Short mmCIF file of N, CA, C and O in Angstrom, two decimals:
data_model
loop_
_atom_site.label_atom_id
_atom_site.label_comp_id
_atom_site.label_asym_id
_atom_site.label_seq_id
_atom_site.Cartn_x
_atom_site.Cartn_y
_atom_site.Cartn_z
N UNK A 1 -8.85 -51.77 30.03
CA UNK A 1 -7.79 -52.93 30.12
C UNK A 1 -6.42 -52.08 29.29
O UNK A 1 -5.40 -52.89 29.21
N UNK A 2 -6.54 -51.23 28.73
CA UNK A 2 -5.86 -50.51 27.68
C UNK A 2 -4.83 -49.73 28.16
O UNK A 2 -3.63 -49.28 27.85
N UNK A 3 -5.01 -49.49 29.51
CA UNK A 3 -3.87 -48.85 30.00
C UNK A 3 -3.87 -47.31 29.94
O UNK A 3 -2.93 -46.68 29.81
N UNK A 4 -5.11 -46.83 29.51
CA UNK A 4 -5.52 -45.55 29.07
C UNK A 4 -5.43 -45.52 27.46
O UNK A 4 -5.06 -46.55 26.97
N UNK A 5 -5.29 -44.12 27.16
CA UNK A 5 -4.96 -43.87 25.46
C UNK A 5 -3.68 -44.13 25.84
O UNK A 5 -2.81 -43.80 26.45
N UNK A 6 -3.30 -44.23 24.26
CA UNK A 6 -2.10 -44.12 23.79
C UNK A 6 -1.63 -42.96 23.34
O UNK A 6 -2.47 -41.94 22.90
N UNK A 7 -0.28 -42.45 23.77
CA UNK A 7 0.37 -41.29 23.44
C UNK A 7 0.46 -41.13 21.74
O UNK A 7 0.45 -39.80 21.34
N UNK A 8 0.50 -42.08 21.14
CA UNK A 8 0.46 -41.91 19.57
C UNK A 8 -0.88 -41.57 19.18
O UNK A 8 -0.75 -40.84 18.06
N UNK A 9 -1.94 -41.61 19.62
CA UNK A 9 -2.91 -41.41 19.34
C UNK A 9 -3.27 -40.04 19.60
O UNK A 9 -4.13 -39.14 18.83
N UNK A 10 -2.89 -39.46 20.96
CA UNK A 10 -2.81 -38.15 21.03
C UNK A 10 -2.41 -37.12 20.19
O UNK A 10 -2.30 -35.96 19.72
N UNK A 11 -0.79 -37.70 19.60
CA UNK A 11 -0.52 -36.82 18.47
C UNK A 11 -0.80 -36.61 17.42
O UNK A 11 -1.08 -35.65 16.72
N UNK A 12 -1.53 -37.73 16.70
CA UNK A 12 -2.36 -37.78 15.76
C UNK A 12 -3.61 -36.88 15.99
O UNK A 12 -3.88 -35.93 14.84
N UNK A 13 -4.06 -37.08 17.03
CA UNK A 13 -5.45 -36.32 17.53
C UNK A 13 -4.80 -34.62 17.62
O UNK A 13 -5.88 -33.75 17.42
N UNK A 14 -3.79 -34.22 17.69
CA UNK A 14 -3.48 -32.79 17.99
C UNK A 14 -3.44 -32.59 16.70
O UNK A 14 -3.32 -31.08 16.52
N UNK A 15 -2.64 -33.35 15.61
CA UNK A 15 -2.65 -32.59 14.22
C UNK A 15 -4.39 -32.17 13.74
O UNK A 15 -4.49 -31.59 13.01
N UNK A 16 -5.03 -33.09 13.95
CA UNK A 16 -6.60 -32.93 13.79
C UNK A 16 -7.08 -31.48 14.47
O UNK A 16 -7.52 -30.44 13.52
N UNK A 17 -6.77 -31.51 15.65
CA UNK A 17 -7.22 -30.14 16.42
C UNK A 17 -6.65 -28.74 15.64
O UNK A 17 -7.32 -27.81 15.45
N UNK A 18 -5.64 -29.16 15.55
CA UNK A 18 -4.74 -27.82 14.63
C UNK A 18 -5.11 -27.62 13.23
O UNK A 18 -5.58 -26.48 12.63
N UNK A 19 -5.64 -28.76 12.71
CA UNK A 19 -6.03 -28.62 11.28
C UNK A 19 -8.11 -27.82 11.42
O UNK A 19 -7.94 -26.93 10.52
N UNK A 20 -8.34 -28.29 12.22
CA UNK A 20 -9.87 -27.83 12.49
C UNK A 20 -9.63 -26.21 12.96
O UNK A 20 -10.45 -25.80 12.11
N UNK A 21 -8.92 -25.93 13.82
CA UNK A 21 -8.62 -24.64 14.16
C UNK A 21 -8.44 -23.83 13.24
O UNK A 21 -8.81 -22.60 12.93
N UNK A 22 -7.57 -24.17 11.79
CA UNK A 22 -7.30 -23.69 10.74
C UNK A 22 -8.50 -23.44 9.88
O UNK A 22 -8.59 -22.38 9.35
N UNK A 23 -9.14 -24.68 9.59
CA UNK A 23 -10.48 -24.93 8.66
C UNK A 23 -11.03 -23.80 9.41
O UNK A 23 -11.98 -23.19 8.38
N UNK A 24 -11.41 -23.94 10.85
CA UNK A 24 -12.62 -22.62 11.26
C UNK A 24 -12.32 -21.26 10.40
O UNK A 24 -13.33 -20.42 10.23
N UNK A 25 -11.15 -20.99 10.30
CA UNK A 25 -10.64 -19.69 9.69
C UNK A 25 -11.40 -19.67 8.06
O UNK A 25 -11.83 -18.41 7.68
N UNK A 26 -11.15 -20.90 7.66
CA UNK A 26 -11.53 -20.71 5.84
C UNK A 26 -13.34 -20.81 6.04
O UNK A 26 -13.60 -20.13 5.12
N UNK A 27 -14.01 -21.57 6.59
CA UNK A 27 -15.26 -21.28 6.55
C UNK A 27 -15.85 -20.15 7.13
O UNK A 27 -16.93 -19.78 6.47
N UNK A 28 -15.38 -19.18 8.06
CA UNK A 28 -15.75 -18.20 8.61
C UNK A 28 -15.42 -17.09 7.50
O UNK A 28 -16.28 -16.03 7.06
N UNK A 29 -14.24 -17.16 6.61
CA UNK A 29 -14.02 -16.37 5.62
C UNK A 29 -15.19 -16.52 4.44
O UNK A 29 -15.48 -15.87 3.37
N UNK A 30 -15.55 -17.80 4.37
CA UNK A 30 -16.52 -18.33 3.36
C UNK A 30 -17.92 -17.71 3.76
O UNK A 30 -19.39 -18.64 2.88
N UNK A 31 -18.29 -17.44 4.93
CA UNK A 31 -19.51 -16.90 5.08
C UNK A 31 -19.90 -15.88 5.06
O UNK A 31 -19.33 -15.19 4.20
N UNK A 32 -21.42 -15.40 4.87
CA UNK A 32 -22.16 -14.63 4.64
C UNK A 32 -22.20 -14.59 3.40
O UNK A 32 -21.26 -15.04 2.30
N UNK A 33 -23.41 -14.00 2.65
CA UNK A 33 -23.64 -13.47 1.54
C UNK A 33 -23.84 -12.14 0.97
O UNK A 33 -24.06 -11.36 1.81
N UNK A 34 -23.63 -11.71 -0.27
CA UNK A 34 -23.67 -10.21 -0.60
C UNK A 34 -25.21 -9.75 -0.83
O UNK A 34 -25.31 -8.94 -1.50
N UNK A 35 -25.99 -10.91 -0.47
CA UNK A 35 -27.61 -10.34 -0.82
C UNK A 35 -27.83 -9.09 0.25
O UNK A 35 -29.02 -8.41 -0.29
N UNK A 36 -27.44 -9.13 1.30
CA UNK A 36 -27.69 -8.04 2.27
C UNK A 36 -26.67 -7.16 2.39
O UNK A 36 -26.39 -6.46 3.54
N UNK A 37 -25.56 -7.02 1.51
CA UNK A 37 -24.29 -6.36 1.56
C UNK A 37 -24.22 -5.02 0.61
O UNK A 37 -23.39 -4.65 -0.11
N UNK A 38 -25.51 -4.12 0.55
CA UNK A 38 -25.56 -2.99 -0.04
C UNK A 38 -24.49 -2.01 0.49
O UNK A 38 -24.75 -2.12 1.59
N UNK A 39 -23.75 -1.38 -0.40
CA UNK A 39 -23.04 -0.31 0.28
C UNK A 39 -23.60 0.95 0.60
O UNK A 39 -24.70 1.57 0.52
N UNK A 40 -23.00 2.13 1.66
CA UNK A 40 -23.58 3.00 2.00
C UNK A 40 -22.39 4.22 2.50
O UNK A 40 -22.68 5.23 2.18
N UNK A 41 -21.15 3.47 2.42
CA UNK A 41 -20.13 4.69 3.33
C UNK A 41 -19.48 5.26 2.33
O UNK A 41 -19.20 4.55 0.98
N UNK A 42 -19.86 6.48 2.33
CA UNK A 42 -19.00 7.41 1.31
C UNK A 42 -18.61 8.88 1.81
O UNK A 42 -18.83 9.11 2.95
N UNK A 43 -17.65 9.19 1.16
CA UNK A 43 -17.02 10.45 1.96
C UNK A 43 -16.51 11.17 0.72
O UNK A 43 -15.24 11.97 1.67
N UNK A 44 -16.45 11.21 -0.22
CA UNK A 44 -15.79 11.90 -1.32
C UNK A 44 -16.51 12.31 -2.35
O UNK A 44 -17.65 11.95 -2.86
N UNK A 45 -16.36 13.86 -2.67
CA UNK A 45 -17.14 14.23 -3.76
C UNK A 45 -16.70 14.30 -5.08
O UNK A 45 -15.45 14.70 -5.29
N UNK A 46 -17.44 13.89 -5.78
CA UNK A 46 -17.33 13.61 -7.61
C UNK A 46 -16.41 14.87 -7.92
O UNK A 46 -17.51 16.24 -7.89
N UNK A 47 -15.23 15.01 -8.57
CA UNK A 47 -14.87 16.40 -9.34
C UNK A 47 -15.24 16.02 -10.95
O UNK A 47 -15.80 16.79 -11.56
N UNK A 48 -14.34 15.30 -11.16
CA UNK A 48 -14.01 14.90 -12.58
C UNK A 48 -15.30 14.24 -13.21
O UNK A 48 -15.85 14.50 -14.25
N UNK A 49 -15.73 13.67 -12.31
CA UNK A 49 -17.27 13.07 -12.44
C UNK A 49 -18.33 13.93 -12.83
O UNK A 49 -19.18 13.53 -13.85
N UNK A 50 -18.35 15.32 -12.21
CA UNK A 50 -19.03 16.06 -12.82
C UNK A 50 -19.18 16.45 -13.92
O UNK A 50 -20.18 16.78 -14.96
N UNK A 51 -17.73 16.62 -14.48
CA UNK A 51 -17.81 17.01 -16.12
C UNK A 51 -18.30 16.31 -16.96
O UNK A 51 -18.71 16.32 -18.12
N UNK A 52 -18.12 15.02 -16.36
CA UNK A 52 -18.47 13.75 -17.44
C UNK A 52 -20.14 13.55 -17.30
O UNK A 52 -20.76 13.47 -18.43
N UNK A 53 -20.69 14.14 -16.24
CA UNK A 53 -22.06 13.80 -16.18
C UNK A 53 -22.66 15.01 -17.15
O UNK A 53 -23.89 15.17 -17.68
N UNK A 54 -22.11 16.40 -16.90
CA UNK A 54 -22.43 17.33 -17.51
C UNK A 54 -22.65 16.97 -19.23
O UNK A 54 -23.29 17.43 -19.91
N UNK A 55 -21.63 16.06 -19.63
CA UNK A 55 -21.52 15.54 -20.93
C UNK A 55 -22.69 15.01 -21.28
O UNK A 55 -23.61 15.16 -22.29
N UNK A 56 -23.06 13.94 -20.19
CA UNK A 56 -24.25 13.23 -20.23
C UNK A 56 -25.85 13.64 -20.35
O UNK A 56 -26.55 12.95 -21.18
N UNK A 57 -25.79 14.88 -19.76
CA UNK A 57 -26.79 15.76 -19.82
C UNK A 57 -26.99 16.48 -21.08
O UNK A 57 -28.34 16.09 -21.74
N UNK A 58 -25.98 16.72 -21.66
CA UNK A 58 -25.83 17.48 -22.92
C UNK A 58 -26.26 16.29 -24.12
O UNK A 58 -27.12 16.78 -25.12
N UNK A 59 -25.79 15.11 -24.27
CA UNK A 59 -25.95 14.04 -25.18
C UNK A 59 -27.25 13.74 -24.78
O UNK A 59 -27.65 13.16 -25.87
N UNK A 60 -27.88 13.82 -23.88
CA UNK A 60 -29.20 13.07 -23.28
C UNK A 60 -30.26 13.42 -24.35
O UNK A 60 -31.43 13.03 -24.75
N UNK A 61 -30.37 14.87 -25.29
CA UNK A 61 -30.96 15.47 -25.78
C UNK A 61 -31.13 14.59 -27.31
O UNK A 61 -32.25 14.48 -27.64
N UNK A 62 -29.64 14.38 -27.70
CA UNK A 62 -29.64 13.63 -28.61
C UNK A 62 -30.06 12.07 -28.70
O UNK A 62 -30.35 11.77 -29.37
N UNK A 63 -29.80 11.65 -27.24
CA UNK A 63 -30.35 10.25 -26.94
C UNK A 63 -32.19 10.14 -26.81
O UNK A 63 -32.11 9.12 -27.76
N UNK A 64 -32.41 10.61 -26.53
CA UNK A 64 -34.22 10.94 -26.23
C UNK A 64 -34.51 10.90 -28.04
O UNK A 64 -35.59 10.38 -28.00
N UNK A 65 -33.83 11.71 -28.67
CA UNK A 65 -34.32 11.78 -30.14
C UNK A 65 -33.98 10.58 -30.76
O UNK A 65 -34.64 10.28 -31.63
N UNK A 66 -32.90 10.14 -30.48
CA UNK A 66 -32.27 8.83 -31.31
C UNK A 66 -33.27 7.80 -30.64
O UNK A 66 -33.78 7.11 -31.77
N UNK A 67 -33.48 8.03 -30.01
CA UNK A 67 -34.44 6.72 -29.20
C UNK A 67 -36.09 7.02 -30.11
O UNK A 67 -36.77 5.56 -30.22
N UNK A 68 -36.46 8.06 -30.16
CA UNK A 68 -37.72 8.30 -30.83
C UNK A 68 -38.04 7.66 -32.14
O UNK A 68 -38.73 6.75 -32.37
N UNK A 69 -36.85 7.73 -33.08
CA UNK A 69 -36.95 6.94 -34.51
C UNK A 69 -36.66 5.81 -34.29
O UNK A 69 -37.52 4.78 -34.88
N UNK A 70 -35.84 5.14 -32.90
CA UNK A 70 -35.56 3.70 -33.02
C UNK A 70 -37.13 3.08 -32.39
O UNK A 70 -37.30 1.89 -32.90
N UNK A 71 -38.05 3.73 -32.08
CA UNK A 71 -39.46 3.26 -32.02
C UNK A 71 -40.10 3.32 -33.20
O UNK A 71 -40.92 2.39 -33.64
N UNK A 72 -39.99 4.00 -33.86
CA UNK A 72 -40.52 4.54 -35.40
C UNK A 72 -40.36 3.04 -36.44
O UNK A 72 -40.87 3.00 -37.04
N UNK A 73 -38.75 2.58 -35.82
CA UNK A 73 -38.83 1.71 -37.12
C UNK A 73 -39.11 0.69 -36.27
O UNK A 73 -39.19 -0.35 -37.10
N UNK A 74 -39.36 0.27 -34.92
CA UNK A 74 -39.67 -1.06 -34.65
C UNK A 74 -41.20 -1.26 -34.85
O UNK A 74 -41.83 -1.82 -35.07
N UNK A 75 -41.76 0.04 -34.61
CA UNK A 75 -43.47 -0.15 -35.30
C UNK A 75 -43.29 -0.26 -36.60
O UNK A 75 -44.63 -0.53 -37.06
N UNK A 76 -42.41 0.23 -37.30
CA UNK A 76 -42.99 0.27 -38.94
C UNK A 76 -43.69 1.17 -39.24
O UNK A 76 -44.31 0.89 -40.19
N UNK A 77 -43.67 2.37 -38.52
CA UNK A 77 -44.40 3.48 -38.68
C UNK A 77 -45.95 3.02 -39.18
O UNK A 77 -46.80 3.98 -39.70
N UNK A 78 -46.35 1.65 -38.76
CA UNK A 78 -47.61 1.04 -38.53
C UNK A 78 -48.72 1.87 -37.58
O UNK A 78 -47.80 2.52 -36.72
N UNK A 79 -49.66 1.48 -37.48
CA UNK A 79 -50.71 1.97 -36.64
C UNK A 79 -51.80 1.83 -37.33
O UNK A 79 -53.08 1.54 -36.51
N UNK A 80 -52.39 2.71 -38.43
CA UNK A 80 -53.91 2.62 -39.09
C UNK A 80 -54.31 1.13 -39.41
O UNK A 80 -53.66 0.22 -39.95
#
C-alpha cells in the first residue's frame, strides 16, 4: 500500500552498492597469506655477490676455528 519503494530509499541504497563494490577491492587485496608464497622466479647472475661469497669462504676457515674455542669455553674444558 506503500505504492512501491520510495526513490529516496533507492538513492541511499545506491550509495551502499557503490561502497560495497569498492570494499570488495579492499578485501581482495587483503586476501591470501604468505604461507604458500615461496619465491622462485629468478633471471640474474650475481656478479659482485660472488666476490662477497669468496670472502665468506676465506673467512670461514677463521670462523670454524673461533667456533672451536667457543665450544671449549662453554664446556669449561671439563669432561674428565
